[PDB]
Write a protein that binds this ligand. Structure first.
Ligand SMILES: CCCCCCCC/C=C\CCCCCCCC(=O)O[C@H](COC(=O)CCCCCCC/C=C/CCCCCCCC)COP(=O)(O)OCCN
Ligand code: SF4
Ligand code: SF4
Ligand SMILES: [Zn+2]
Lengths: 208, 96, 371, 176, 125, 97, 112, 115, 48
């Protein structure tokens, strides 16, 4: 591994593995999987019912005390039965470490709101609802935060079109801004960039 | 080598010119039409054919790294001349 | 920027403050999914448009972590030098705009002259005054011109007097103090729980700085101090930002003195494009240039969360790779989001004229808040 | 390491208290700020006399686009479509066909300058230095239509700015 | 705590799609064919969903190609055919499913080239 | 700066500093706008031999994340994610402002 | 005694040894009701007993700060009430029970 | 089988109750909205539009979808009451500037290829 | 040119009073500078 290759830290990998095993042991009721990546990141996979217990444990426990909510977001994977996965990123100032917690849901199953655990989660859950349509139960005030008033649909879903369905302009007859079906003078050009001759053998999937 | 349409418009190097019944001509009334006066085909046709005493010649368009990628041209066919795929320059062996 | 602010007032006092955002929501995160990684790089220039190269650096670090490569040392030194220059730009903008909103309006011009000089540095290094796109996921695009370091040294040896004039105008003025002292006080526990970062944390006495605890490029090879507040008000945050300007000057001096020689992008033509002469003389170089500028480089599958100490706080990106040359998902973390979320709490029991001061001390730019 | 910005203790001796009272009653810091502003008035302003004086620029500056050509006079573009593929804003539209002499040349080359982000990716993707971003920036337009450039406009821009473009490229090409 | 309701999933009223872009479109479920210009097979692993092609006309100015259907560039990826079918059904799109084409195994023999009496004997190599 | 002596004295007194030492307007001290050509050093991978790409391929060394405690398949001391952070030092260059 | 701990909202606590002892006693009492085989109970008991033995063997407050590896005894006390509240909440939650259910077949398969 | 987690309602009856509550609230709000926004429509056709929007989702046979639609309608009502919308957002429900799309086979055949 | 002026004001142009077809006694603009003098005037090079 000469200078063009990224250096690998063994000590952090072992520490994160040990802490993941520790967290898995303490909460067997919810934790489903623990992973440590080759660039020293620890993410924990839990059941949806354990969002509040796991987050409260990670925030309040003396050994964890992850007091800072770095980010909360969602990822849309249409091929899964549970369409959306919910990702929590946490930072610990006491021990100078970062942890990730992943959850899953679909269109109709609500997720428990974590505003009681982290005050920062309010606007993040509002944005998740606005962009993906994931409902959060017991939220103080859940409503759109980014889309226009009266906007229909959720744009960050994979089946939503890039340019949407309606566009805006000014009409002199009605003397106001109106919404009409979208027509583009030049259609967005779609490029097929993926090549054959796979790049990374280490990620090859079984031929099923 | 700019030509003129029978109606009166200039013909571009790509050969574009609106036909007589075309309504889109109205965009040029009270205005002009943008046409480049220098045609690349005519300009490259005026270049002399280089004479080299080798079967294979290399061309980079002149200027080293300011030209095009370097390519090699075969000059065994005496019927025609070797033409650069990028620059359009022509090379030829000293026939007779 | 542009903000819609719905509030309830009982007499002079502000009872409730509800900010409405989305007036600059362009849908950047969905547009990124239709681009390659290099094609998606320039969006980060436009995300937080007061500190551009910092967003470039964050995105480049994320892509480098996913690619399992590292930039050459000279590239890292250039990145840190221009990050400190960009921090100076951002702090000038924040402080001068806060003063302008209060009503000073003279230091705005005084320091925007220096901002114009730093824009000249940007234009000389990349040909663009603000959205340079200089920091790439393999290093930097081009090497510095032969006379750039001398001009940077000439600029940076007179900036302390400009900061001194700013302090003479603002620091000890009684009107400025009565405008900023004991305004928008936030406790350390509330700051931590609400997701604050950067100066919003350090003004309450929390000792946290990502360049110190989790350094990324070469920040562990330079020494500097971290200003810490004591009361958690607007005045302490203003003092912290001024001290950060001085520390940025210190780091700039250190970077200027210790610039090493060598190449500027990783010597791996499957990630970084080759030189023009190589592309025009070598078959492999031409093939790699073609494939890098048409399809792009493939990134191994995986997800990462990379954060840097941006001038406005912790700026992070949650980048997800599916193994192709286009990102599957790109979530952007902006400190202004959490700061504007906490604005409602910070303006409890304050005058109507204090909301402007709180917004100014939060250092909010809506390009990163709305994305 | 870390510093304290506002962690001082005011002195409570009689002289210090009297000094602070004099500051309160006589407005010393206000007069000092006034003096700063007055002094700053008597120094030369930084204003330049535009348009008779111009702001400094660099050979790396990205301005209006142009299509260049070889010294023989033939255009450098070979319709490889790398610039159109790399364009982050999808502002380039290209069509091509063999010419009357069999050359690989474009029949359509449009750049929508109201979609362009002026990133310069096209000129660094070009393998033959055909498309560049010239130094011109004073090309404001009164209508949206005139900012939609076609091949003729870009070739005219190249013929118009070739001297400066070539000088700038000669200055900067050793960094590329 | 559990409804235990029995009915097929239908989220059509929640997606915000216009009325005439739901029951009028026709999605296609298929495994993309291998590009014959290349011998690589990495692009024939997943299942793709795409909509029916609609009108494209020439812009009167600049001669660009215009469109009116927002779903002209929408392509989805699924691990299996069942996932794509379920997604299409729950989104209310009528679909046609094409069974995956797999290249059948072949009997290759280098010694067959140099045959004593068989026609497989090559003239050159 | 082409300023008279009296004006320089007045501005210096009113500001409280010596301005002529640190002027904010650029003069001949800046570098010339025309520079010599730059040679530019090559990268480490420019060797002619002992430079096989498989020995310097960062991307192909990436691996899927390690799985610990897959639920589908002693003293035991308590542990923390990382050793506790050391307290910062009080900046023995200018501890107080 | 010191003043102005440095964190806004965190006041100086005189006589912190008594407060720490009371909080640790409360934490142990709450832990006593948890099932013995629970990992949370034994781990938190080990940590709390370690800290209680550490504080019972040091009268000085600064040396206690250095030894406890937390510093600023006031925030250690804050962490103590945080742990006590978490212990009560976790006793209510009972997470030592087995997993609620497994995820679907390919819920965590990446890529695709 | 197919056990699923409730959002708000356990069966269809509670869903109908919430739908009736939301319809009542909208029917109250229509006249005040018409007056406050200085709309050119009458209260009668505004309430008819509310009725049409409620009829648009009359075929839903799942409590989760029903009460999620109720949640979205409550969000719209909150936006309308607090005057967070402008006249354009309210007037977008009527499509007064869009040409009337014909339905018969001949008209669609003549206009273009779109079925 | 005047090298004693600070950077930016050390070079300037006095525009002509009659360019291609209009009277530019009052109506002058920065697009009237030819490319070579454009390069010199914007300090892209030190050589006129
Ligand atoms: C034995 C014989 C004794 C006879 C009696 C004489 C004794 C006099 C000694 C004291 C007199 C001084 C009084 C002069 C005015 C004092 C007013 C004052 O001090 O009020 C200030 C406020 O005054 C101001 O700050 C006003 C400034 C507003 C900004 C305007 C800029 C003004 C500065 C420019 C100089 C003005 C020049 C004035 C001269 C004009 C000439 C015609 C207090 O405010 P705070 O600091 O917030 O503290 C109170 C709350 N705890
Ligand atoms: S400068 Fe960038 S955006 Fe503009 S045409 Fe070139 S590649 Fe496209
Ligand atoms: S301008 Fe350059 S990159 Fe673009 S098509 Fe022509 S030769 Fe290719
Ligand atoms: Zn050639």
């Amino acid at each position: 591994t000469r200078p063009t290759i990224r250096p690998r830290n063994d000590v952090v990998h072992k520490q994160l593995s040990a802490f993941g095993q520790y967290v898995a042991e303490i909460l067997p009721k919810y934790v489903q999987q623990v992973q440590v990546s080759c660039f020293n990141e620890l993410e924990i996979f839990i059941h949806p019912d354990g969002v509040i217990p796991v987050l409260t444990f990670l925030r309040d426990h003396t050994n964890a005390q992850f007091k800072s909510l770095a980010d909360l977001t969602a990822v849309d994977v249409p091929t899964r039965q549970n369409r959306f996965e919910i990702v929590y990123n946490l930072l610990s100032l006491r021990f100078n470490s970062r942890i990730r917690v992943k959850t899953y849901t679909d269109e109709l199953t609500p997720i428990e709101s974590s505003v009681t655990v982290y005050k920062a989660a309010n606007w993040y859950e509002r944005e998740i609802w606005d962009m993906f349509g994931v409902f959060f139960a017991n939220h103080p005030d859940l409503r759109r935060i980014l889309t226009d008033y009266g906007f229909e649909g959720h744009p960050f879903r994979k089946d939503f079109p890039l340019s949407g369905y309606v566009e805006l302009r000014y009409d002199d007859e009605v003397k106001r801004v109106v919404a009409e079906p979208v027509e583009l003078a030049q259609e967005f050009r779609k490029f097929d960039l993926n090549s054959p001759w796979e790049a990374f053998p280490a990620y090859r999937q079984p031929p099923e | 080598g700019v030509r003129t349409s029978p109606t009166g418009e200039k013909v571009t190097h790509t050969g574009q010119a609106y036909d007589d019944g075309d309504y889109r001509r109205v965009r040029f009334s009270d205005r002009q039409k943008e046409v480049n006066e220098n045609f690349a085909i005519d300009l490259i046709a005026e270049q002399p054919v280089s004479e080299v005493g080798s079967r294979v010649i290399s061309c980079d368009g002149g200027g080293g790294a300011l030209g095009h990628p370097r390519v090699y041209i075969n000059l065994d066919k005496e019927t025609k001349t070797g033409t650069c795929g990028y620059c359009g320059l022509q090379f030829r062996q000293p026939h007779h | 920027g542009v903000l819609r602010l719905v509030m309830e007032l009982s007499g002079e006092m502000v009872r409730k403050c509800d900010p409405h955002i989305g007036l600059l929501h362009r849908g950047t995160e969905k547009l990124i999914e239709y681009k390659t990684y290099l094609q998606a790089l320039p969006y980060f220039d436009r995300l937080d448009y007061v500190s551009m190269m910092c967003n470039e650096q964050a995105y480049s670090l994320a892509v480098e972590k996913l690619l399992n490569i590292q930039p050459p040392p000279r590239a890292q030194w250039i990145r840190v030098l221009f990050g400190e220059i960009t921090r100076l730009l951002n702090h000038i903008m924040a402080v001068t705009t806060h003063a302008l909103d209060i009503g000073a309006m003279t230091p705005f011009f005084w320091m925007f002259e220096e901002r114009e000089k730093m824009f000249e540095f940007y234009e000389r290094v990349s040909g663009a005054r603000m959205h340079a796109a200089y920091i790439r996921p393999g290093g930097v695009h081009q090497d510095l011109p032969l006379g750039l370091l001398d001009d940077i040294y000439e600029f940076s040896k007179n900036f302390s007097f400009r900061i001194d004039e700013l302090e003479e105008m603002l620091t000890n003025n009684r009107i400025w103090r009565n405008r900023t002292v004991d305004i928008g006080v936030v406790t350390a526990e509330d700051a931590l729980n609400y997701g604050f970062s950067g100066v919003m944390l350090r003004g309450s006495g929390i000792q946290w700085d990502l360049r110190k605890t989790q350094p990324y490029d070469v920040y562990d090879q330079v020494e500097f101090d971290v200003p810490i507040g004591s009361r958690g008000d607007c005045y302490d945050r203003y003092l912290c930002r001024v001290e950060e300007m001085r520390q940025s000057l210190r780091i700039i001096s250190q970077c200027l003195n210790k610039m090493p020689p060598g190449e500027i992008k990783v010597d791996d033509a499957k990630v970084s494009p080759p030189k023009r002469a190589e592309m025009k003389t070598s078959m492999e170089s031409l093939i790699h240039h073609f494939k890098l500028y048409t399809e792009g480089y493939q990134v191994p599958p995986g997800a990462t969360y990379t954060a840097i100490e941006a001038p406005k706080g912790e700026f992070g990106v949650y980048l997800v790779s599916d193994g192709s040359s286009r990102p599957y998902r790109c979530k952007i973390k902006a400190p202004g989001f959490a700061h504007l979320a906490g604005l409602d709490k910070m303006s409890k029991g304050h005058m109507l004229a204090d909301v402007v001061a709180i917004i100014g001390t939060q250092d909010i730019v809506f390009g990163e808040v709305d994305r | 390491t870390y510093k304290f910005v506002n962690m001082r203790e005011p002195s409570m001796d009689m002289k210090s208290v009297t000094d602070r009272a004099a500051q309160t009653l006589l407005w010393t810091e206000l007069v000092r700020g006034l003096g700063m502003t007055l002094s700053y008035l008597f120094r030369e302003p930084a204003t330049i006399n535009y348009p008779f004086e111009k702001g400094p620029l660099s050979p790396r500056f990205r301005g209006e686009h142009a299509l260049r050509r070889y010294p023989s006079g033939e255009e450098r573009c070979i319709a490889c479509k790398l610039c159109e593929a790399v364009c982050p804003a999808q502002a380039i539209t290209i069509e091509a066909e063999p010419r009357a002499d069999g050359s690989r040349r474009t029949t359509r080359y449009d750049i929508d300058m109201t979609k362009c982000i002026y990133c310069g990716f096209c000129q660094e993707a070009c393998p033959v230095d055909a498309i560049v971003e010239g130094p011109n920036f004073e090309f404001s337009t009164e209508t949206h239509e005139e900012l939609l450039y076609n091949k003729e406009k870009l070739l005219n821009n190249g013929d118009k700015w070739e001297a400066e473009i070539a000088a700038n490229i000669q200055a900067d090409y050793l960094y590329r | 705590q559990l409804i235990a309701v029995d009915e097929k999933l239908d989220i059509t009223t929640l997606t915000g799609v216009p009325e005439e872009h739901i029951k009028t479109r026709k999605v296609r479920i298929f495994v993309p064919a291998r590009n014959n210009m290349q011998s690589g097979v990495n692009n024939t692993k997943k299942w793709k969903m795409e909509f029916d092609t609609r009108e494209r006309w020439e812009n009167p100015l600049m001669g660009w190609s215009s469109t009116a259907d927002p779903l002209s560039n929408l392509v989805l990826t699924f691990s299996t055919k069942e996932d794509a079918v379920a997604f299409a059904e729950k989104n209310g799109w009528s679909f046609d499913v094409e069974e995956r084409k797999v290249p059948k195994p072949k009997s290759k023999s280098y010694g067959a080239n140099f045959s004593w009496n068989k026609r497989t004997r090559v003239s050159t190599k | 700066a082409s300023a008279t002596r009296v004006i320089q004295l007045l501005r210096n007194w009113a500001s409280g500093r010596d301005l002529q030492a640190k002027l904010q307007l650029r003069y001949q001290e800046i570098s010339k706008r025309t520079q010599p050509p730059p040679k530019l050093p090559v990268g480490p991978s420019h060797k002619l031999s002992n430079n096989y790409y498989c020995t310097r391929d960062g991307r192909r060394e990436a691996m899927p994340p390690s799985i610990v405690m897959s639920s589908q398949k002693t003293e035991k001391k308590a542990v923390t994610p990382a050793p506790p952070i050391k307290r910062w030092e009080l900046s023995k260059d200018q501890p107080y402002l | 005694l010191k003043k102005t701990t440095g964190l806004v909202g965190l006041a100086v606590c005189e006589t912190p040894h008594e407060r720490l002892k009371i909080l640790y006693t409360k934490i142990l009492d709450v832990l006593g009701q948890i099932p013995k085989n629970a990992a949370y109970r034994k781990y938190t008991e080990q940590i709390t007993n370690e800290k209680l033995g550490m504080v019972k063997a040091e009268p000085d407050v600064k040396k206690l700060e250095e030894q406890l590896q937390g510093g600023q005894i006031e925030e250690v006390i804050l962490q103590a009430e945080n742990e006590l509240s978490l212990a009560r909440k976790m006793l209510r939650w009972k997470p030592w029970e087995p997993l609620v259910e497994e995820p679907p077949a390919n819920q965590w398969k990446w890529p695709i | 089988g197919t056990s699923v987690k409730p959002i708000f309602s356990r069966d269809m009856n509670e869903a109908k109750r919430r739908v009736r509550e939301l319809y009542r609230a909208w029917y109250r709000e229509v006249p005040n909205t018409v007056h406050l926004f200085q709309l050119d429509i009458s209260v009668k056709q505004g309430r008819d539009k509310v009725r049409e929007m409620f009829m648009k989702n009359a075929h839903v046979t799942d409590p989760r979808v029903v009460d999620l639609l109720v949640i979205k309608g409550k969000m719209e009502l909150e936006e309308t009451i607090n005057v967070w919308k402008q006249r354009t957002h309210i007037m977008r429900f009527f499509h007064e500037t869009e040409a009337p799309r014909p339905t018969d086979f001949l008209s669609k055949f003549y206009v273009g290829h779109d079925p | 040119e005047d090298n004693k002026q600070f950077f930016g004001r050390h070079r300037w142009v006095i525009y002509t009073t009659e360019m291609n077809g209009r009277d530019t006694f009052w109506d002058v603009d920065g697009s009237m500078v030819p490319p070579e003098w454009h390069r010199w005037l914007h300090c892209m090079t030190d050589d006129p």
